[PDB]
Amino acid sequence: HHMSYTWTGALITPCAAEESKLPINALSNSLLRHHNMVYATTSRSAGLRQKKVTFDRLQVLDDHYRDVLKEMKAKASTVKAKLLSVEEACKLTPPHSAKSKFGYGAKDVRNLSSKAVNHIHSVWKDLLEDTVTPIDTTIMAKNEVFCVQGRKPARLIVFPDLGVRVCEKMALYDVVSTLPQVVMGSSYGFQYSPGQRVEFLVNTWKSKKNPMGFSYDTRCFDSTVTENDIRVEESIYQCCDLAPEARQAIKSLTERLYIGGPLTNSKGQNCGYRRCRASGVLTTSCGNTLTCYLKASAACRAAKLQDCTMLVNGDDLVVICESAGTQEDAASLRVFTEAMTRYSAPPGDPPQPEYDLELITSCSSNVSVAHDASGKRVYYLTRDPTTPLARAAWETARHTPVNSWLGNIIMYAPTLWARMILMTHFFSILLAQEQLEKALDCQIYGACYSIEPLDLPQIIERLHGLSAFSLHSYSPGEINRVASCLRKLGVPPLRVWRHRARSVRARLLSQGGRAATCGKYLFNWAVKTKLKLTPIPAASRLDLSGWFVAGYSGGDIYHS
Numbered sequence: 001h002h003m004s005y006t007w008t009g010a011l012i013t014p015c016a017a018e019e020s021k022l023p024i025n026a027l028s029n030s031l032l033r034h035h036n037m038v039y040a041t042t043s044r045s046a047g048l049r050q051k052k053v054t055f056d057r058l059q060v061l062d063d064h065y066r067d068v069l070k071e072m073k074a075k076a077s078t079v080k081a082k083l084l085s086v087e088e089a090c091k092l093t094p095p096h097s098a099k100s101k102f103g104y105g106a107k108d109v110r111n112l113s114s115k116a117v118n119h120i121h122s123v124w125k126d127l128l129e130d131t132v133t134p135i136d137t138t139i140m141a142k143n144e145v146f147c148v149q150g151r152k153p154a155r156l157i158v159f160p161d162l163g164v165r166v167c168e169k170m171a172l173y174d175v176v177s178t179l180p181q182v183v184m185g186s187s188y189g190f191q192y193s194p195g196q197r198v199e200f201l202v203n204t205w206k207s208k209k210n211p212m213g214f215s216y217d218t219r220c221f222d223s224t225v226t227e228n229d230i231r232v233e234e235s236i237y238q239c240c241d242l243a244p245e246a247r248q249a250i251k252s253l254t255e256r257l258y259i260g261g262p263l264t265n266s267k268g269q270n271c272g273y274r275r276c277r278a279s280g281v282l283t284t285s286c287g288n289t290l291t292c293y294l295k296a297s298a299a300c301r302a303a304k305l306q307d308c309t310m311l312v313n314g315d316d317l318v319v320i321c322e323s324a325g326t327q328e329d330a331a332s333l334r335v336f337t338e339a340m341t342r343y344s345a346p347p348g349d350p351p352q353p354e355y356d357l358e359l360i361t362s363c364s365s366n367v368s369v370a371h372d373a374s375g376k377r378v379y380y381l382t383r384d385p386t387t388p389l390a391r392a393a394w395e396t397a398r399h400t401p402v403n404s405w406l407g408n409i410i411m412y413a414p415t416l417w418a419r420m421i422l423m424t425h426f427f428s429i430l431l432a433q434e435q436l437e438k439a440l441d442c443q444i445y446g447a448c449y450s451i452e453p454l455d456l457p458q459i460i461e462r463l464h465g466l467s468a469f470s471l472h473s474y475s476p477g478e479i480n481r482v483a484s485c486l487r488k489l490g491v492p493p494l495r496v497w498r499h500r501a502r503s504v505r506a507r508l509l510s511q512g513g514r515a516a517t518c519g520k521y522l523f524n525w526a527v528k529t530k531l532k533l534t535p536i537p538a539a540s541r542l543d544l545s546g547w548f549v550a551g552y553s554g555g556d557i558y559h560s
């Protein structure tokens, strides 16, 4: 059998005590009252996950598959990519990346200490000399926060040692950063800020005489990825103009790490063996994106979809095409699904044809409509606020390595719920500790950034434009979704938030400087007598390079 996993019976074990119930402090009730709805996943559900993700993969590859692949390799052949030096790779490591098993940590790597650097050189040398020995990985259960829907089992994270991760950056950081946009062009989702994503989708939608669209949800995508898929990815990478040392490092990491390897729990026991995508390597995002695009492109051909345009972000897939009527479309999607299945990517929820752009969810998000200061209709990116709000409830009472609320304000700044609930609540908390100036870690497209909350108005103006501070008259469908979420979690109604916001705003203005700019721009929506919002001079000085270039989820990337 071609099983995604084989297991020894050893348990996936935790690294510390794990909390599953929402921690509660004196601030918790100001955000939500239904605490029993928020939970975190733990290793206790890791066995249930192992069950779901362990299956036999069969793959039948036809001429559409090979045709798309040759086209992809033709574009990949135009890419020239460079090896990073050790210092460069080290400086890309998150400060609290998991320490090495060889007696150094992420801080020693970042500081280029002799023990970290020497070992990295020794790992590199071993990669060039040995192209067969499977590389050990650690398997963990992720602790992630959700609202009961009741419970999702914990996801599994599979990752190699810190020295190897630095070596992966050296060989592949420039490749995974530049190749997907070259191969997939306008279809590569991670090149877009949220506004550009919205622009791409709307323009694509308008470019069809009779538009039809659908999202495609692969069942446990990482588990569907076969040895073939992973060797196909390597062959694409090798199309690049690369140093012969990078060629050798990439071959080696493919053979020894990417295709598969033994799994070790946190106690050092052998848990079994992986034959599918490792969720915590540098190539996780790029590999998944390339493989999802290959399979989907070939499936579009197989299904004879007319004038199909895709948007792919890792395992996340949206297709927009020419409609041929409701019946022909439902038929086409069934053929598309069959093709995908034959390629090892069967669906979770079966895909359905959609005739309203606003109702297509991709990357957990949708397009919606609001109005700017001049009353002009404006499209913007939004999402169901449930998960953002559950994580904020958790982050309200617990410090966490990644502040999802901050990532969410940045990505969803134009939304009704980010502005009325998240900015209000978190600025209120930060004021009360005078922690406005304290840099916080967050993630955007899987890479980690250290961000000062006082820089939000400028960050938002750079990413979303001044209109993100001006939007009004949101759509009934959006207002109803937000209101439904507030009922579910026991969040105070929007009117309470408006009230609180006038207070937060007044408090920030009182502080002058950057704090007062936050009060001015972020909360201008809260007062009847609205201030005049002008371009912020600090905004045009922001080094927002690399922000929306590529996706690095699982990839251990720090861009600060």
Ligand SMILES: Nc1ccc(Br)cc1C(=O)N1CCC[C@@H]1Cc1ccccc1Cl
Pocket (backbone or CB within 6 Å): 415, 416, 419, 420, 471, 472, 473, 474, 475, 479, 494, 495, 496, 498, 525
């Ligand atoms: N007109 C707006 C202006 C700013 C923001 Br943020 C949201 C809106 C907006 O469309 N709505 C509709 C539902 C909530 C909000 C209006 C509202 C209702 C009660 C209290 C405060 C507000 Cl801003």
Ligand code: NI
Pocket (backbone or CB within 6 Å): 001, 002
């Ligand atoms: Ni076989």
